[PDB]
Amino acid sequence: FKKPPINNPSDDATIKLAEAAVSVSDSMLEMAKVEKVITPPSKDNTLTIPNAYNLQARASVDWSGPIEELTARIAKAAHFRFRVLGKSPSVPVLISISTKDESLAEILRDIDYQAGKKASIHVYPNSQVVELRYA
Amino acid sequence: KFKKPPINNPSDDATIKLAEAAVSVSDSMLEMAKVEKVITPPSKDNTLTIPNAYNLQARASVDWSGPIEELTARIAKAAHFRFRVLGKSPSVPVLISISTKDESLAEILRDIDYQAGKKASIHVYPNSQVVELRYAKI
Amino acid sequence: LPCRVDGACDATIIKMMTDLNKKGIKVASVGQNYLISIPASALFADQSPRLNWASYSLLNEIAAFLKQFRKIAITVTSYSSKYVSVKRERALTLARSRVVSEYLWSQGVDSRIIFTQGLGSDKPITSYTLGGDRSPNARVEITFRRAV
Amino acid sequence: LPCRVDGACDATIIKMMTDLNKKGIKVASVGQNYLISIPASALFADQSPRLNWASYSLLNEIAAFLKQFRKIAITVTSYSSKYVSVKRERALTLARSRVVSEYLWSQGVDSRIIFTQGLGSDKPITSYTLGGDRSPNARVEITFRRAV
């Protein structure tokens, strides 16, 4: 022998309350469907994982501040050269990564992300150089 | 002997007037959602940015009202997907509240992705095994 | 006043834990990871995703045991021995675990997530492969971690 | 003070409802749609728009049953079996229903509308077509919805 559910709508008002809960909750969801506009992954603008074996080492960083200096250091932690193209403005592009262990290619993906469109990162792994670009 | 069919439990007037508020706010809710979905058509869903996977086709049932970090970390931990974030979290918490029963993990992440609309988004990269949660730029 | 007991007592926890181990549902208790292991003979019919009617009593002290703990995510995962193929097998065990978690959140858990999944004898606890659901490999397991 | 009962009691409602079903006037009670179905043998003479004198007693607990409910529109519609033509038949059933609604608003209804109409066996409740007004198809029906 089995039981009915415990918080079951077992009651002629509470069924109406809970059918309205299902109606509001899914009507919330297609509100979220219509205003949630996305990126397509083929047009996402963010940096990939650059699949180089120096960039799959295993790093650890706690920092807030101006973008160029973590990227210079993860170039020299990655044994990569560091180029900068563009001009850094008077207000600096400020990021924060506080991760106690993750992988340093995914640093550079979160760097490119938290830069956004104030700056950008590329990397060329055959030449082993990280570049930081402005706009 | 005469009997109407539904002889339910004794309800009280609290949930009587809660229910008949709840239906008027439900119909005002769906007439709003009808207006929004007609005067901008939804271009595109999120099945392209969260695509399904074998070992993401497990199922779960979840009630949850906290922030999105702990829930998406638990989904990816039981999906055997490495979870990461992009972007730092805002000081106000992006709070979701998922109350569903028996949905696949891929569609649960799609509901999480929709409910955190324009504050975060979930991306799943299934030829790798990562679930990322990325915050907004603001 | 604040509550001393949270609708549960430790004497009743070990009373259900002895009674479940006497009826053969083996409760492992490692750290705060709790495992209750249920043979699929003791719940379902053979090679079926269907409960027997008497086995909801077994699910009754499973659910009343799951009353007693503060828990965040129960995961329920099922696997049996080989019957036709691994694809038919994984469909069976996915339906198997999703049926027993549908009954467990019909009943009382204070869990926030039940994850539920099934595998195709990919993790078998003995090498002795006697038959169908009478195998001790053919089992569902309900594992969680007791929060604080 | 405001009134508790509105000139009616539920014990008297089911007392008239059992008594009307014992005398063969069948009271269907679906939701708040109420149907009382009256065979045309039990009121009129055969193929006539004329009441018998004893059948106003049957109309007496029909009208005293219709005291008991708060109602907005009673519709009374009559139909019998085929006698000459459907045109003569629909004239018969229109006169039939308008005569019984003339007596029902001579008597006490608290209805605001009685709609009243007749049909030409266009809706017959059995396929067995024995005769004239002794057919169980040959009937008037009084349907309404009990307001709040």
Added chain:
Amino acid sequence: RDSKRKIIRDLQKQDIQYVEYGDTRTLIIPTDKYFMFSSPRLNEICYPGLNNVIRLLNFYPQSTIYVAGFTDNVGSRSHKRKLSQAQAETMMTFLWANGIAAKRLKAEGYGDKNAISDNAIIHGSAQNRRIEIQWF
């Protein structure tokens, strides 16, 4: 004690309406106690109503069966229609799987478009949430 008057008297006891109406015979089954909530999963604890309704309609083995599902005013009209259609359709499969031949049966869902009570009141909308079973 195995007959019509016995089984209709205990369907009154487990609160399913029946109407005798000429040739048309109609069971009104509440979805609120014979379905788990807002779902086409049958309320499995209420099996003796389901066995007693199928025990009743072994008595009419040549009639075509209309089965129809009903909701109340909540939700979108699509949700009304698909939920009523799903519940009527799974009651139709219950009668087919308890042994009525499939071309006797007809499942159809109304999103309260017949509406045997008003949806503005609680107990009336509880009466509106139902399955009708008609046959001849």
Added chain:
Amino acid sequence: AAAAAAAAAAAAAAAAAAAAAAAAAAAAAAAAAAAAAAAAAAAAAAAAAAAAAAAAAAAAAAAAAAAAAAAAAAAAAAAAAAAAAAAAAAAAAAAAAAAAAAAAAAAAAAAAAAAAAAAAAAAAAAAAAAAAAAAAAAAAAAAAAAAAAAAAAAAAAAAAAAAAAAAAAAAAAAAAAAAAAAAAAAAAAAAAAAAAAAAAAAAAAAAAAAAAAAAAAAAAAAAAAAAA
């Protein structure tokens, strides 16, 4: 007793005897070729009312419309029928090619029946203890009564399906809008999630919805389709 020619015979209700190895290609309009052995026909014909029957060693390849098909011992057909089909077999094998509308199929023996296109309205398939039917294009109301220890495999995208398996049968169904399943000691595999699904399992019975996990976009079980 061979008959192999391309002509206009056109009126033959030919119930031939044994060893009638007729590989004809003639324009047989009013045709009913109920051969009894050794048929090895590879024609390009047009019949449109054929109530064909075929006994043992009947290999055929025809582009003609039939009306009824009967199998007796063992065969291998490849026919292109068009309009309607009343088909029955006995321990044989059969294949058909073009768009047919098979209303009823009763297989009470070991029948390896295949149809590459079945566009019907109500296909009632009754199976008994040995057969193997594999018919797949598009039905509108499928009624698969497998009373059988046998198999009914399908990728037939039916709009409504009603499959009942009685004693260790195995049926592979695919329902578009309506799924109706009853199983008893047997297996019913649902290869597509319907718009509304309902499945009931008896003693030791498995209605497992064995769709392929990791599809391109596997649609999840919604609120109207989530059964246990």
Added chain:
Amino acid sequence: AAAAAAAAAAAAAAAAAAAAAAAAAAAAAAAAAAAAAAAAAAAAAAAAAAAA
């Protein structure tokens, strides 16, 4: 290796078994694809499935 129909954009396919639907507005009549039994007629231009 498909078999199209003459109506508004239906096509059977005989790789293993399919009865899918096209669009017939971009006119991808390549007649050359990788048809699979997972509802995917992956043609030269685009991909087609059993439409719903």
Added chain:
Amino acid sequence: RDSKRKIIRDLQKQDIQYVEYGDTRTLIIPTDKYFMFSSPRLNEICYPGLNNVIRLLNFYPQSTIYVAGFTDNVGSRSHKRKLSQAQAETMMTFLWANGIAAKRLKAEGYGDKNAISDNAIIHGSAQNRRIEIQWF
């Protein structure tokens, strides 16, 4: 009184867990009472737990032996790994020196990477500090 149920009952008495699990059998030994502190020196006063665990695994003389060491959240990850590795490795030498043949055994150290409880609470981290002994 010389058997399995006797020796598992007194390993319950000197507070070492055992699990029966199909073929997998696992002893959970607390490092906090079976090792002197933050060291791979065995807690020599607690010899009857060590004799009783080796008296238990004379009963399985063909199984390969996995032995693994565990810590909690304190210290560097290198200190976690080398301390857990050192304690698992010296329990492996204890079983080898009490007479199990060396290619049955496998010592491996996890710096709480399996973590059978949370390290945020005192008694839970006490449960995390352990040695697992698995065999088949």
